[PDB]
Amino acid sequence: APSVDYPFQWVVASYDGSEAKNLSDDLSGSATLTKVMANYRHAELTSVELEVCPLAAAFSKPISVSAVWTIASISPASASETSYYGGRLFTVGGPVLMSSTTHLPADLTRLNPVLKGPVKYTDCPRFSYSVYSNGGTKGTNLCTIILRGVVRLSGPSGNLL
Amino acid sequence: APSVDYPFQWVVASYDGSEAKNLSDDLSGSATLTKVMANYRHAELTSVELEVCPLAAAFSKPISVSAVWTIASISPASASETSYYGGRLFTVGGPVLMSSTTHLPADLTRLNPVLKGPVKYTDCPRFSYSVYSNGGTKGTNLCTIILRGVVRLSGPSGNLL
Amino acid sequence: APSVDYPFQWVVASYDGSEAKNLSDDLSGSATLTKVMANYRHAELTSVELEVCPLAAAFSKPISVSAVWTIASISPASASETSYYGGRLFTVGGPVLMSSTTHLPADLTRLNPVLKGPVKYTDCPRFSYSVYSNGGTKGTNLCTIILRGVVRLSGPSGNLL
Amino acid sequence: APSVDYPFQWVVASYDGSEAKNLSDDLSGSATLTKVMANYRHAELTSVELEVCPLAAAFSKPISVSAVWTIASISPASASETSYYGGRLFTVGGPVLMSSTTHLPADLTRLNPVLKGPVKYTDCPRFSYSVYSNGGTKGTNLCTIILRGVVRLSGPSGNL
Amino acid sequence: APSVDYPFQWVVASYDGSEAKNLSDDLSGSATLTKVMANYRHAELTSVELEVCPLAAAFSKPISVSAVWTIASISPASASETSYYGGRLFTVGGPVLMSSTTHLPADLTRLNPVLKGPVKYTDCPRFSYSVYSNGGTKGTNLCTIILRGVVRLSGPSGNLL
Amino acid sequence: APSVDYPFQWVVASYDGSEAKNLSDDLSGSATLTKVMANYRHAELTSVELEVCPLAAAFSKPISVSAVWTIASISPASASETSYYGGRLFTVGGPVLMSSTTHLPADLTRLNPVLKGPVKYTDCPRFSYSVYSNGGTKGTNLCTIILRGVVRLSGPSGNLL
C-alpha cells in the first residue's frame, strides 16, 4: 500500500519549576497527532523521541524532569519514571545549555509502532514524564518538552477536507 | 517517490435564484485544497469535476448554472462561461431531480494536473461558474455545487501541525 | 556541464538580547549569495547550515534563539520555529561556550538544493530564526548567527567583471 | 504539438544623436510580441536579432550604438553594454550605408528560446542597447533599431 | 579538477587625441580580472585579445594606437610598442568604422596562460599600448579599448564573500 | 625519495584579554618551523591544526578568539576571520574548560601541503586569528594558541650540523 513518511513536531508543554507536573500520554490518543492521522486509516511510527530543551531562564536555575517511554499498557506514576527501563532523569540548565543528552528516543523495537489501524493496539508507545518542584517563579516557563518524529501514513480515508 | 491518492469532496456553496452569483476559483489557491495540501511538497490531480446537485426546492423551480473549466491564466468573467470552449450551461430542477448530465469534469490532459510542486505552474485548472437568478426566497437553496476529485500527494513537509 | 564547488561563509547577523528579532530568509533571494551566483546561471546547494556562535559577553547572560530550516513555501512566524520539524532551540552562553550543538544543518534531502536556474523554484531552503528578549544591554552584541555552506555553480553568464 | 511559425518584425525605435538613449527589453514582456502571442499557451523563439540600419541623414553623421543580448536575469546599465560578454559597439553611417555587420543575432542555444509556457523562465533573451549622442538636430533620426525574428506558437488558449 | 570557462569582457578605457596616453598592464595584476579571480585558487587563460573599437567621433578624426602583447618580465615603454616583436600600430577612424583588423590576440602558446596558481609565474601576458594625440577635444572619446577573453577558473577559495 | 614524518608542536602565543591582538602567519615563513625544515629540501604537511587551550584564569573570564585557515594568497583582516569559509569563533573559559571543540584543523585538501620545495608556493596554509578585547589583567595570560602537526621531510641538505 502506498504511504508517505510524515515528519511531525510540536512543543508538548512549557514548564516552570513552581510545582511538580506529571503528564503521561499515549501517542495513539494524543489530540494533536489524531488530527494528522484523522485523514488516514493506517499510521505506523518510523521514529519518535521526547526532547527537553532548556530555556535561558534555566541558566541560573536548573529543572529536573524524569521521563520514560513505556508500553501503552504500563502507566508509570509520578516521580517513578527512573524505576522503569529506559527511564531517564534530565537536568536542564546550569552553565551548559548545549548538550544533546536531553533527547529520549523511543525504542520502537520494544514498542508497537502502529498508532492507528483496523484495531486499537494496547502496546503503542506512551511517554510519561514528571517535572519536579523547583524554586519556581510562576511566569518564566524555563523548560520545554517537545515531541518530534515520523509517521508513515497509508490508506487515506474519506474525511473532511 | 512515495505518494497517496487522496480523494477529496466538499460543497463549494449552495445557491438559490435570489440573485446572480459568480464564483471563479483556481484550484491551486482554493482554501479547502490549500489546507489539505499545505502539509505536502507535491500535489497532482488525477481527477476533478464540478457537479450541480438539485435539491427538493428545485423540483418546482429549476435553476441554471453556467460552468467552465479554464486554464489558470484565463479568468472568465461573470455570466460568460458559455463564451469559452467547454463552457456548459446546466439546468437543475423539474421532475428529473437526478441526472449525471450535470457533471463537468476537468480535462487534465489539456490542463495541468499539478497544483503544487517545485515550480509555480500557470496552467493549473480553474473552475468558473455563474448562477442565474430565477426567483429564489433568499433561503430556499435550490441547488448546491460540489467539487470532488483525487489528489496524489507526495513529500510531506514539516508544517505547523 | 562543468561546475565548481564554491564554499561560502558570512556572519548573518550579530544580536544582543535587548529585544526579540525575527529573521526569515530564502537562500535564493539573499543579497549576499546572489552576488556570488550573479556570474553563474545554475547554482545547487551541496550543503549549508546555520551556526549560532556564542560570544564572551554571553558567558554571564545566555540567549535563546529558535531556528528552523523550512521549505521556501512555508514561512514560519516569530517564536514558532520549534513547532516545525527540525526546529531547534539553541541556548548560547553559560559556563560552556564550547559545544558544537549550535549547528543546524539543512536537510537537503527534504529541500530543493537548486538556488538558481532557468526557473524560480518554490521549494528552496529558507532559514527562519527568532531571538528572544533577554536582559539586553543595547551594545554588547553577545550572539552571532552565521551561514556556511557549499554551492555548485555551473554555466557562467556574461555578467559584469 | 501542432504549432505555427510566426515571423515578426517591428522597428524598435528610431534614434538621432540629440541625446544618449538606453533601452533594455525582455522578449517575454515585449508588448507587441506579447500581444502577438497572447492567444497561445506556448511560444518559443526559433530566431531573433537586433538590426541597426543606417538612414540617409547618417551619411554625414554616424551614430555609435552599444548592444548586447543577455539572459532576463542580467539587466545591463546605460552605456555599459560593452562590459558584458557578447556586447558589440556598432557604428552606423559614413560612406558605407548598408551592411550585414550591424545585425546582432541572439544565441538561442545559449539563451532560452521559450518566451511563454507552463513556467515563467528567468533566462529568457533580453536585448539592451545604448545610443550615444553625436549632435543630431532633434529630427534627423539617423538610425533605426529594428527587432525581427520568428516565434513558434503552440497550444491555442480560448481567451475570449 | 572541475573548472568553468569564464568569459570576460570589459572596456579598459576610452581615449581621444587630446594627449598621448600610455597604459601597460600585466593580466595577473589587472584590477578587474583580480576581482574576478580572487575567489578561485587557479586561473588559466584560454583566449584573450585587445580591440580598438572606433566611435562616431573617430569618423572625421582617426586616431592611432600602438599595442603589443609582451611577456610579464618585459615592460614596454611609452610610444615604443612597435619596437617589440608583435607590436602592431592600429589606426581607427575614417569611412571604414568597422573592421576586425584592429584585434590583437595574445599568443598563449608563446606566453603563459596561467594568471593564478600555486606558483607565481613570470611569463604571464602583459598588454601595453600607447594612444597618440591627434587633436581631441578632451571629451570627444574618439576610440575605446576593449579587453575580452576566457579564463578557466578552478578551485574556488573561501574568500570574503 | 626517502622521507620521515616529523611531528611538531609549539605554543604559538599566550594571550590575555587586555587588548585585541591579531596574528596572521604562513607556515612556510614561520621562524620556528623553518629551523626544522632548514636541514631538508622538501617539506609537505601531512596534517596541522590550531588549538586554543583555555587556562585556569579563564574559568571566571572567557576569551573569544576568531581563527581561520586560509590560503597563502588570502590574508584575512583583524576580527574578520568568521567571514571566510572555515573561520570559527572559539570562546574559551566558563565552567567547562574541557571540550575539544577548540581544535581548528587545516583542510589540506583545499590547501597546498608543501611548505618547502624547489619553488615558493603561493597556496601554502596560512593561519590567521584575532583575540578580542576582554576585561584584561595585563599579567594573567589566560589563553594559549598552539600549533601541532606533522611534516614529511625529504631530501636532507648540506646545512649546519
Author numbering:
A (entry chain A), B (entry chain C), C (entry chain A), E (entry chain C), F (entry chain A): 36 to 196
D (entry chain B): 36 to 195
What does the paper say about this structure?
In attempts to reveal where (if in the inside or outside) GFP is displayed on the GFP-recombinant CSDaV virions (CS-GFPdupCS), we have determined the cryo-EM structures of both the WT- and the CS-GFPdupCS-derived virions. The primary sequence of the CSDaV major CP (CPp21) was used to generate initial models (by automated homology modeling) for the WT and CS-GFPdupCS virions. Both final models were built as a single asymmetric unit that comprises three chains (A, B, and C). Analysis comparing our results with protein domain structure annotations available in the CATH database, revealed that the CSDaV capsid has similar subunit arrangement and tertiary structure with desmodium yellow mottle tymovirus (DYMV), in which chain A forms pentameric capsomeres while chains B and C form hexametric capsomeres. However, analysis on the position of each asymmetric unit chain in the capsid of WT-CSDaV particles indicates that the N-terminal region of the CPs is displayed towards the inside of the particle, whereas the C-terminal region is directed to the outside surface of the particle.
CSDaV is a positive-sense, single-stranded RNA virus that belongs to the genus Marafivirus in the family Tymoviridae and has a monopartite genome of about 6.8 Kb. In brief, CSDaV encodes for three quasi-equivalent CPs that share amino acid (aa) sequences at the C-terminus but differ from each other at the N-terminus. The whole capsid models of the two types of particles are almost indistinguishable and reveals a T = 3 icosahedral symmetry that gives particles with a diameter of about 30 nm.
